[PDB]
C-alpha cells in the first residue's frame, strides 16, 4: 500500500511565494486524508466538496496540491468568489471549486529577525487572473500612458512586492502556510482512492 506522498507537501521546507505557487500532482496511490485532518494542529481546514470523513471514500483521478505562504489577514481571501490582492493577482480559484484548503500559522519557521524578504506577491497587474492561472512575469508595470522600458521609476513599478514578517508582528501579519488540495475527476482510471 504505497501511501500518497503528503509529507513532501505539508512538511516541505521552502514554500514558494504566492505568485509562483508550487503545484504538485498526486496520483497512482492511496492517501489517508483523515489522519491529516485529525492532526488538529492546523489553523483552518475548510472544505468545499464534502466533509473530511466522507472525502476519504470517494476515489479520484487526480489531486493537485498548491502550496505557498501568505499573510494572516488575507487567508480569508482563498476561496471562490473572494476578491483582493491574492484572489485577483496571485492565485485565483474557480467558482466551480472542488477540493479544499488547509492553512496554518508558520510564524517562527518563516519569520526572520528583521522580517524575511524572500516572499513576494504581484502587487501590480492590469487585469485579474483567470481561475487557477499562473503569472510569473516580472516585467515592470505599465502604469498609465507613458512607458519607461525597464527603468524602474515613476508610473512604472516593479510589480512584485515583499513581506515584512517581523517575529513580533500582529498575528494578522505573521505568515501562514497554505495548501489547496484540489481534487479532480475525469474519464480515466481513478488512481487516488481511500
Amino acid at each position, epitope marked *: 500500500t504505497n501511501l500518497c506522498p503528503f509529507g513532501e507537501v505539508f512538511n516541505a521546507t521552502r514554500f514558494a511565494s504566492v505568485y509562483a505557487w508550487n503545484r504538485k500532482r498526486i496520483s497512482n496511490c492511496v492517501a489517508d486524508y483523515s489522519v491529516l485532518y485529525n492532526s488538529a494542529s492546523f489553523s483552518t481546514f475548510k472544505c468545499y466538496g464534502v466533509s473530511p470523513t466522507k472525502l476519504n471514500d470517494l476515489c479520484f483521478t487526480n489531486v493537485y496540491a498548491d502550496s505557498f505562504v501568505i499573510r494572516g489577514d488575507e487567508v480569508r481571501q482563498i476561496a471562490p468568489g473572494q476578491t483582493g490582492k491574492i484572489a485577483d493577482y496571485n492565485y485565483k480559484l474557480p467558482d466551480d471549486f472542488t477540493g479544499c484548503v488547509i492553512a496554518w500559522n508558520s510564524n517562527n519557521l518563516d519569520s526572520k529577525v528583521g*522580517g524575511n524578504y524572500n516572499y513576494l506577491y504581484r502587487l501590480f497587474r492590469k487585469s485579474n487572473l483567470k481561475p487557477f492561472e499562473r503569472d510569473i512575469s516580472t516585467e515592470i508595470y505599465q502604469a498609465g500612458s507613458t512607458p519607461c522600458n525597464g527603468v524602474e521609476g515613476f*508610473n512604472c513599478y516593479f510589480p512584485l512586492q515583499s513581506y*515584512g514578517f517581523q517575529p513580533t508582528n500582529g498575528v494578522g501579519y505573521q505568515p501562514y502556510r497554505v495548501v489547496v488540495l484540489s481534487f479532480e475527476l475525469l474519464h480515466a482510471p481513478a488512481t487516488v482512492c481511500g
Partner: antibody
Amino acid sequence: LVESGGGLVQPGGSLRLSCAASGLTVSSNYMTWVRQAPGKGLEWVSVIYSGGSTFYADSVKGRCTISRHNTLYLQMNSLRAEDTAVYYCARDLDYYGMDVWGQGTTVTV
Amino acid sequence: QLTQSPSFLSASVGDRVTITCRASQGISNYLAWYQQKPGKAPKLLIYAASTLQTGVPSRFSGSGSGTEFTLLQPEDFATYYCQQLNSYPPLTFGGGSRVEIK
C-alpha cells in the same frame, strides 16, 4: 491633478461625484475616494482596483464606485447626515501610500 | 487595529519637532506619513521609512508597533496624519496631531 464635481443637495437625494485624470490614465491604478468631515480627521469610502473589483467601508456601504474612460464616478442614494463633508481622489500604491490627490469637493445635505 | 498619535504641539520656529503614533499590535512597515495644510488636500511624506519628493527637511521614521517621525521651517503650520498601509477593508487614519508655531 484631478477634478471636482457636484455640491450640496437635499437629504437622501441621489448624490453623485466625478473625477478626472491629469497625466495618468484611470485603468491601471488603485483609484480611491477619501472623505473628510468638516471638523474631523480623514476616512476612506471607496477603492477601485485595476481588475475591476471594488471595495467600500462600513459606513456608506451602499455607495457605488465606478470606472470608465477617464471620468471616474462615485454615487450614493442614502445621503444621510454624515454625507456632508469633503471628498478627494487619490491613486494608491498600497506599499507607497495615497499618492497625488484631487482638489477635493464638498457636499452637504 | 487602532492607531493612537500624540496631541497638538506648539513649537518655536527653526526647531526640529517629533511626532509619534503607537499602533495596537504590530505593523512594522505599513505606516505612511501625510501633510495636510488647511484648506488643501493632504500631501504624503513618508513610506515605511523613505521619503518621496519634497519633505527632505521633515523625514524620519522608527516603526515597530509604535512609529515616530521628526521634522523647523516656519511653513509647517499644518496637520500631520498617519495612515496604516495594508488593512484592506479599513484604511484607518490616525488621530492626527496638529502643530502650531510660536
